[PDB]
Ligand binder design. Structure first.
Ligand SMILES: *[C@@H]1O[C@H](CO)[C@@H](O)[C@H](O)[C@H]1NC(C)=O
Lengths: 126, 111, 75, 495, 110, 125, 49
């Protein structure tokens, strides 16, 4: 049984930065790249970035490149997404989807079945 | 961020009917590669992967859901439309750049 | 320098690409050509010396090639 | 099922009387094994792990000098003495300067001077060693049967991965539904790690020759130095200048990382960041197909229609792969897949996904096959709704024969005598060839150790000319052959 | 050549297998096979339980097994009887010709 | 094989206490005699060894200037002498043996070093 | 291929390891210890000639 668990929804002021946490359970956390896809109450899904839990390599979207940091903890097998300077338009539900890295460890081409498992989601209100 | 894949805002279908949801993109993402995944999302619940690799579907997804790609357009066909298939369907692609571009989404409404 | 003695002909080479293989495959030839162009005078002397110590066309060409290759190489 | 998309893929066909084959797995390659009434299997050497390496030496790349002191002696009075000259973390040099009345001496001449500055290593690079016992190769064995149901299966991966170590010669892998496969691997002979060092510089690691590494002209510490200050050849990383025989100063030579990168031009980059993982080199194994049986051979051919869900795509090796969905009933059944001529008289193409079967109706199946050169027709299913897909290969038998000869030659150049053990069944010819190759390779490695590819080409051209100009047709042929092989090896060498 | 590192305490219910770790350096524990484990009951002199990493004296039970990986050497007890409750000290003959003893660990068993 | 030490001794700080270990049941001259201390509630601590065959010694750096180890071949007794005692020296002193090589040199131990100990000597200050 | 040096290796006591000296042949060889059920086979390469 593979389940991804995120921290509970939080409410913040526009100038603050929030750190959501995704906890991977039921698989080798270090062997999968953790993605962070955002949604807003009625708007489309927005890919943000991925952190390679195996070696910590990350990639962000240009929209969120300047004000998002994706971090992982090998020991507790958790993936953090801290959104700094997080303004009101950032009120959103933040999911964490997972995709598997290659045998070599690095994340170069994703697996065709990416985002197979998602978290429940965290609602951040600004 | 590239540009979001465009698909019809809404789709309505009577029970037992076949419904097609079309997703359009550039040659970089949908025209270029086969990373066309369709995600079903009932409201207030995380998106569920229904189709990946354009046509392939996960183990728990039924044979009603079948997808296709033509040029720069990807299609999601739902045969045997049921009332339980009331969710926002998002098409996502892995782009040539190495990023992900979700589609706008279509709301599938029964009858 | 450490750079003067590279890890080139050591018999450890697999199918996997080696460090700086692509770029560094022709560095010696490029450096020799640039040195010969910068110092045309020495190449004439090397050719004259090789022709003087000859007795066969093959001998002279080999001598000239070796002299021109080691003249820039010997620091 | 994972080696279709890999450019360096080799097909090992057949087994021996004992139902074993000898295959050499390179890291960047894959091997597909095919034998009569045996399932097709894909083998990939995906990892080599060096466990618990021991630091052999420590080399200084970036240093600094502090506490510079000098002592001078009037001419004819011997040598100057510095207290710091007795500490080996201070680098010192003795030189002679012009001395006289003006600078405080009684007589005119060269007066001794000594300059000592404390030497400190800001940045170093460790060279580590691993015992052959501590290597742990990983191999993935995948039943070469087309089942794209990663989510559907409990495990999640159709390939089974076995860890080979020198401790146990036999490794047994149970492929669910196929019996078990036995691998007799030889980690001892893959790479001589007694003769190699794992050199890790700042955040990058290489795999180097041990004697080359111990001949590096840099300040070094022994692997167990444990105080970190007694560097041996510190004089390689400092310069002493006495320009006019007037004063002597000592300066440090600047960061040598970057010159080390130039020095490492024939090495293989390895990765030591999260463990000493090596993705270079080969592993020679013996593959015993004794308890290996096809899957679903008791099923009946499907009496239904197949829809193509992915068009026939040619692989880089000339084998066509196609995915077919099954629409008929009787879900668990064999797929009637055959490669015919136009008239369907002859079945002239072999199936690489032997015994294709549909386990579930809803799940499609990937079928690979090796059609013949020229026109061929892939017929899938029984005649009601039968799929007849045409194909053209665009090759020639002579052309692929030349390509196979070149592939074997390159393998000999890379693997050496180990190339005789690839897809090899014990024979008189193979053993004799391997012995001859061992002798020749030993002589050639003795003659051509340390030279670069350009030097190899020059020597080969010289030898070719020498042989071509010889009155004996025997020695001439021998020399021409040696030179032509040297030229080939020089062209193929590097990387 | 400094004191080896061991957990302060270790516990295990009777019949379970209990493992103690002794971490040294490239000279203490990772360089040589001079890894010996000593069992000392309170108010008594230490008893040599293992030596040469794995070997045990003639009178030592077979429930005591030693392993060494890199710079760390481990001691594992299987039966874990009440008589196994004691302080376990690890030692090693360092490369400088001296002896280093681990901090020691205590087994509570119950 | 039994190693017997002297009785527990109480010393005022700054004094010198000399302990002894009596080796019976084996050839005293063929074994090296080690000294190991253990503070109450602390770990064991190696002090040094005396090569009874020829009197060679090696002390731990922490005791090089204070601990003195001597032997009496005829008495088959080893002596541990720790001068300039301090508060921290309150600890039970053990004696452990180790066979020296065929030539009495004793530079490499035997894998089974410290096989036999003494009951220990308690020193308090 | 190889001949034993510790001739007649025997196991007097069960919980008492016995260490065996053997002389493998030059090149690749396999040290087989035990009988088929649970037998351990160990590879070795001797680097001389
Ligand atoms: C060396 O120079 C430093 C200042 O650069 C000074 O602090 C130090 O006392 C001097 N001597 C030694 C032995 O470090």
């Amino acid at each position: 049984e593979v389940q991804l668990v995120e921290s509970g929804a939080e409410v913040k002021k526009p100038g603050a930065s929030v750190k959501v946490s995704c906890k991977a359970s039921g698989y080798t956390f270090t062997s999968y790249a953790m993605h962070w896809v955002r949604q807003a109450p009625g708007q489309r899904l927005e890919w943000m970035g991925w952190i390679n839990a195996g070696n910590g390599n990350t990639k962000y979207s240009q929209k969120f490149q300047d004000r998002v940091t994706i971090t992982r903890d090998t020991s507790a097998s958790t993936a953090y997404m801290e959104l700094s300077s997080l303004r009101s338009e950032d009120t959103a539900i933040y999911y964490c989807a997972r995709d598997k890295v290659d045998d070599y460890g690095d994340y170069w081409f994703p697996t065709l079945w990416y985002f197979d498992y998602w978290g429940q989601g965290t609602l951040v209100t600004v | 961020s590239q540009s979001a894949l465009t698909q019809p805002a809404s789709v309505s279908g009577s029970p037992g009917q076949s419904i097609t949801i079309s997703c359009t993109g550039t040659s970089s993402d949908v025209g270029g590669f086969n990373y066309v995944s369709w995600f079903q999302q009932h409201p207030g619940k995380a998106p569920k992967l229904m189709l990946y690799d354009v046509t392939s579907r996960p183990s728990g997804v039924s044979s009603r859901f079948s997808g296709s790609k033509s040029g720069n357009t990807a299609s999601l066909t739902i045969s045997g439309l049921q009332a339980e298939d009331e969710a926002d369907y998002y098409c996502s692609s892995h782009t040539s750049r190495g990023t992900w571009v979700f589609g706008g989404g279509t709301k599938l409404t029964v009858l | 320098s450490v750079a003067l003695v590279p890890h080139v002909g050591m018999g450890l080479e697999t199918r996997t690409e080696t460090w700086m293989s692509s770029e560094g495959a022709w560095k010696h030839a490029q450096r020799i050509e640039t040195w010969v162009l910068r110092h045309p005078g020495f190449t004439i002397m090397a050719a004259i010396l090789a022709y003087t110590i000859g007795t066969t066309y093959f001998q002279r060409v080999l001598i000239f090639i070796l002299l021109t290759a080691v003249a820039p190489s010997m620091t | 099922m994972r080696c279709i998309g890999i450019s360096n893929r080799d097909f090992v066909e057949g087994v021996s009387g004992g139902s074993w084959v000898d295959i050499v797995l390179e890291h960047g390659s894959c091997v597909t094994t095919m034998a009569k009434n045996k399932p097709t299997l894909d083998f990939e050497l995906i990892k080599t792990e060096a466990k618990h390496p021991a630091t052999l030496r420590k080399y200084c790349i970036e240093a600094k000098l502090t506490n510079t002191t000098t002592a001078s002696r009037c001419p004819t009075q011997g040598e100057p003495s510095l207290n710091e000259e007795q500490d080996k973390r201070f680098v010192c040099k003795h030189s002679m300067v012009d001395r006289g009345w003006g600078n405080g001496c009684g007589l005119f001449g060269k007066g001794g001077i000594v300059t000592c500055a404390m030497f400190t290593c800001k940045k170093n690079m460790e060279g580590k060693i691993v015992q052959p016992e501590n290597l742990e190769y990983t191999i993935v064995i995948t039943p070469h049967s087309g089942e794209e149901n990663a989510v559907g299966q409990d495990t999640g991966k159709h390939g089974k991965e076995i860890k080979v170590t020198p401790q146990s010669s036999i490794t047994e892998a149970e492929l669910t539904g196929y019996g078990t496969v036995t691998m007799e691997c030889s980690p001892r002979t893959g790479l001589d790690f007694n003769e190699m060092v794992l050199l890790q510089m700042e955040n990058k690691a290489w795999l180097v020759h041990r004697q080359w590494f111990l001949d590096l002209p840099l300040p070094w510490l022994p692997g167990a130095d444990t105080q970190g200050s007694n560097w041996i050849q510190k004089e390689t990383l400092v310069t002493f200048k006495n320009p006019h025989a007037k004063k002597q100063d000592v300066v440090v030579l600047g960061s040598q990382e970057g010159a080390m990168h130039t020095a490492l031009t024939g090495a293989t980059e390895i990765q030591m960041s999260s463990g000493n993982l090596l993705f270079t080199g080969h592993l020679k194994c013996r593959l015993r197909m004794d308890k290996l049986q096809l899957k679903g051979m008791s099923y009946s051919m499907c009496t239904g229609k197949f829809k193509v869900v992915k068009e026939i795509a040619e692989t880089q090796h000339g084998t066509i792969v196609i995915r077919v969905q099954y629409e008929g009933d009787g879900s668990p059944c064999k797929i009637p897949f055959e490669i015919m001529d136009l008239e369907k008289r002859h079945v002239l193409g072999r199936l690489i996904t032997v015994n294709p079967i549909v386990t579930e109706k809803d799940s499609p199946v990937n079928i690979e096959a090796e059609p013949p050169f020229g026109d061929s027709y892939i017929i899938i299913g029984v005649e009601p709704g039968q799929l007849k897909l045409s194909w053209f290969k665009k090759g020639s038998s002579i052309g692929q024969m030349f390509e196979t000869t070149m592939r074997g030659a390159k393998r000999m150049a890379i693997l050496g005598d180990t190339a005789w053990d690839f897809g090899s069944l014990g024979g008189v010819f193979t053993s004799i060839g391997k012995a001859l190759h061992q002798v020749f390779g030993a002589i050639y490695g003795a003659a051509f150790s340390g030279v670069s590819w350009t030097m190899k080409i020059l020597i080969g051209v010289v030898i070719t000319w020498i042989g071509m100009n010889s009155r004996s047709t025997s020695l001439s042929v021998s020399l021409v052959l040696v030179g032509v092989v040297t030229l080939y090896l020089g062209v193929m060498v590097q990387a």
